[PDB]
Amino acid sequence: GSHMSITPPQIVSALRGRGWKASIVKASTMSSELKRVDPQGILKCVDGRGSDNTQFGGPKMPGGIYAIAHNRGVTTLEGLKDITREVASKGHVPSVHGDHSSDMLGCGFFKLWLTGRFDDMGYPRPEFDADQGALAVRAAGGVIEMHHGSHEEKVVYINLVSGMTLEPNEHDQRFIVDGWAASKFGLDVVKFLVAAAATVEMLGGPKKAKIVIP
Numbered sequence: 001g002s003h004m005s006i007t008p009p010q011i012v013s014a015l016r017g018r019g020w021k022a023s024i025v026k027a028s029t030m031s032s033e034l035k036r037v038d039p040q041g042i043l044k045c046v047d048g049r050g051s052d053n054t055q056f057g058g059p060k061m062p063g064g065i066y067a068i069a070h071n072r073g074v075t076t077l078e079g080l081k082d083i084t085r086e087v088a089s090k091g092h093v094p095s096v097h098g099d100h101s102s103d104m105l106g107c108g109f110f111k112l113w114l115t116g117r118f119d120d121m122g123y124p125r126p127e128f129d130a131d132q133g134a135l136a137v138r139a140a141g142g143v144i145e146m147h148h149g150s151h152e153e154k155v156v157y158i159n160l161v162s163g164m165t166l167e168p169n170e171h172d173q174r175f176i177v178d179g180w181a182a183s184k185f186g187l188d189v190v191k192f193l194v195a196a197a198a199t200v201e202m203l204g205g206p207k208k209a210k211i212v213i214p
């Protein structure tokens with residue numbers, strides 16, 4: 001794994017510097033919501049909408065496992081399958097998702113990645129489309145989740161409490177980003193967080209974040 005080379009205060013700084021409203025929240029005040037990660041839960045997208053998921057308690061990352069492929073510059077189906085098997089071996093059920101309105105293009109993160117919206121940040125675009133990616137994840141043993149309804153996120157949670165997560169609430173929506181999970185998968189954490197912040201921004205999400213720490 002890789003370590004957390006950026007402090008919560010710096011994260012807050014960075015965000016406010018991109019025009020965000022941000023602050024640090026102590027895990028003890030969210031005691032009732034922070035859930036110990038359940039290994040049978042799918043590692044899924046930050047998306048705040050309801051879905052047909054029945055595998056709760058997994059880590060939250062942009063586009064599900066796509067965040068990992070994205071951060072590492074992995075752009076092929078074979079590489080994506082390797083990541084799917086890697087995730088499953090490291091304690092989480094790998095997933096990606098789509099929705100009813102746009103099918104497999106229903107994951108805003110992937111659509112941004114596929115459409116070159118990360119070009120400016122120097123990211124190699126995927127070399128496959130949303131349909132091919134979803135099917136490759138499934139074929140490699142992962143899950144394809146399906147959301148519904150519209151995006152109504154009121155805030156962004158950047159959870160830095162390792163081994164814990166927050167769950168979606170379709171009636172009082174929020175984006176959830178498990179930053180510690182990036183360390184677990186040895187990702188460039190700073191890059192992972194900037195990418196997550198950018199995703200909210202480009203999707204016109206709320207630029208209000210709460211950084212959760214022990």
Ligand SMILES: [Zn+2]
Pocket residue numbers: 045046047062063064097106107108109110
């Ligand atoms: Zn998504």
